[PDB]
Structure 1
Amino acid sequence: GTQPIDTVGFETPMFLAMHGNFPERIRFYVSTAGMVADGFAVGSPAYQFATNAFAGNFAPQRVAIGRMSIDSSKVDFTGTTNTEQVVVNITLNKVVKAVKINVNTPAQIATALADAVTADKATAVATGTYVTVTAVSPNVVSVGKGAGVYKIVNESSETVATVLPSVIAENHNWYFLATEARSDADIVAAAEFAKANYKLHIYNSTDVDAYAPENSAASVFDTLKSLSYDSLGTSDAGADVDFTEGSVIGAMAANDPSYGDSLHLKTMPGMVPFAGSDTQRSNAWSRNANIYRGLYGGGSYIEGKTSSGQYVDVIRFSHWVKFRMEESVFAYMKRRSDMGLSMKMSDEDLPVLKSVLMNNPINIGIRNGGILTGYDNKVSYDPTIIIPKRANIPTNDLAARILRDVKVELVYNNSLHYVKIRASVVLDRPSTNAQTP
Structure 2
Amino acid sequence: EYQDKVVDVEVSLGTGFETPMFLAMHGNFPERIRFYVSTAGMVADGFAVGSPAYQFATNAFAGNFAPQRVAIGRMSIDSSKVDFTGTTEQVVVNITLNKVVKAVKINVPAQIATALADAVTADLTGKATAVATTYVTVTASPNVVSVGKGAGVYKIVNESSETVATVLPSVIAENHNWYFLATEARSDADIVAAAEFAKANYKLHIYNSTDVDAYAPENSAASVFDTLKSLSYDSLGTSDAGADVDFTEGSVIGAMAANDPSYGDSLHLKTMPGMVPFAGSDTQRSNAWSRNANIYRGLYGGGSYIEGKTSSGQYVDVIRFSHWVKFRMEESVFAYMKRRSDMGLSMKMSDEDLPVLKSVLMNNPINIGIRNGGILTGYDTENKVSYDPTIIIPKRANIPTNDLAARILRDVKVELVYNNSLHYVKIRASVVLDR
Q: Normalising by the residue count of structure 2, what TM-score does the alignment of the two structures yield?
A: 0.91
Report deviation, 1:166.
1.4
> Is 1:35 the equivalent of 2:42?
yes
Partners of 2:122 and 2:116 in 1: how far apart? 14
Report deviation, 1:252.
1.0
Instruction: Flag structure 2 segments of 5+ consecutive residues without an equivalent.
Output: 1-14
Change (3 A) 1:9 1:378: closer
Partners of 2:45 and 2:343 in 1: how far apart? 45
Report deviation, 1:94.
3.4
Map 1:145-164 to 2 at 5 A.
145-164=149-168
- The question of whether the paired residues in 2 share the 8 Å contact of 1:88 and 1:147 is answered with no
Partners of 1:317 and 1:354 in 2: how far apart? 21
- The question of whether the paired residues in 1 share the 8 Å contact of 2:16 and 2:324 is answered with no
> Is 1:242 the equivalent of 2:246?
yes
Partners of 2:333 and 2:51 in 1: how far apart? 42
**RMSD value, Cα:** 2.0
SS at 2:294 equivalent: coil
Partners of 2:294 and 2:218 in 1: how far apart? 15
Change (3 A) 1:16 1:202: same
Partners of 2:192 and 2:321 in 1: how far apart? 24
Partner of 2:16: 9
Report deviation, 1:115.
3.6
- The question of whether the paired residues in 1 share the 8 Å contact of 2:49 and 2:93 is answered with no
Q: Normalising by the residue count of structure 1, what TM-score does the alignment of the two structures yield?
A: 0.90
Partners of 1:359 and 1:11 in 2: how far apart? 24
SS at 1:10 equivalent: coil
Partner of 1:427: 433
- The question of whether the paired residues in 1 share the 8 Å contact of 2:236 and 2:310 is answered with yes
Report deviation, 1:62.
1.2
Report deviation, 1:177.
0.9
Report deviation, 1:339.
3.1
Report deviation, 1:61.
1.1
Between 1:356-365 and 1:394-403, the stretch displaced more is 394-403
- The question of whether the paired residues in 1 share the 8 Å contact of 2:117 and 2:130 is answered with yes
- The question of whether the paired residues in 1 share the 8 Å contact of 2:292 and 2:310 is answered with yes
- The question of whether the paired residues in 2 share the 8 Å contact of 1:384 and 1:410 is answered with yes
Partners of 1:409 and 1:13 in 2: how far apart? 30
> Is 1:115 the equivalent of 2:118?
yes
Change (3 A) 1:117 1:378: closer
Report deviation, 1:282.
0.8
- The question of whether the paired residues in 1 share the 8 Å contact of 2:79 and 2:160 is answered with yes
Partner of 2:135: 130
Between 1:395-404 and 1:280-289, the stretch displaced more is 395-404
Change (3 A) 1:91 1:363: farther
- The question of whether the paired residues in 1 share the 8 Å contact of 2:87 and 2:152 is answered with no
Change (3 A) 1:217 1:399: closer
Change (3 A) 1:338 1:31: farther
Partners of 1:96 and 1:342 in 2: how far apart? 63
Partners of 1:356 and 1:374 in 2: how far apart? 22
Partners of 1:30 and 1:246 in 2: how far apart? 14
- The question of whether the paired residues in 2 share the 8 Å contact of 1:88 and 1:148 is answered with no
SS at 1:222 equivalent: helix
Map 1:298-313 to 2 at 5 A.
298-313=302-317
Report deviation, 1:12.
1.6
Count of paired positions: 416
Per-residue CA distance 1:332-360 (angstroms, 9 max, x = gap): 23333443333333233222222111111
Identity of aligned residues (%): 100
- The question of whether the paired residues in 1 share the 8 Å contact of 2:263 and 2:373 is answered with yes
Between 1:237-246 and 1:168-177, the stretch displaced more is 168-177
- The question of whether the paired residues in 2 share the 8 Å contact of 1:43 and 1:89 is answered with no
Change (3 A) 1:36 1:86: closer
Change (3 A) 1:184 1:370: same
- The question of whether the paired residues in 1 share the 8 Å contact of 2:16 and 2:323 is answered with no
Report deviation, 1:141.
0.6
- The question of whether the paired residues in 1 share the 8 Å contact of 2:309 and 2:315 is answered with yes
SS at 2:274 equivalent: coil
Per-residue CA distance 1:259-292 (angstroms, 9 max, x = gap): 2221100111111111111111111111111000
Partners of 1:69 and 1:79 in 2: how far apart? 28
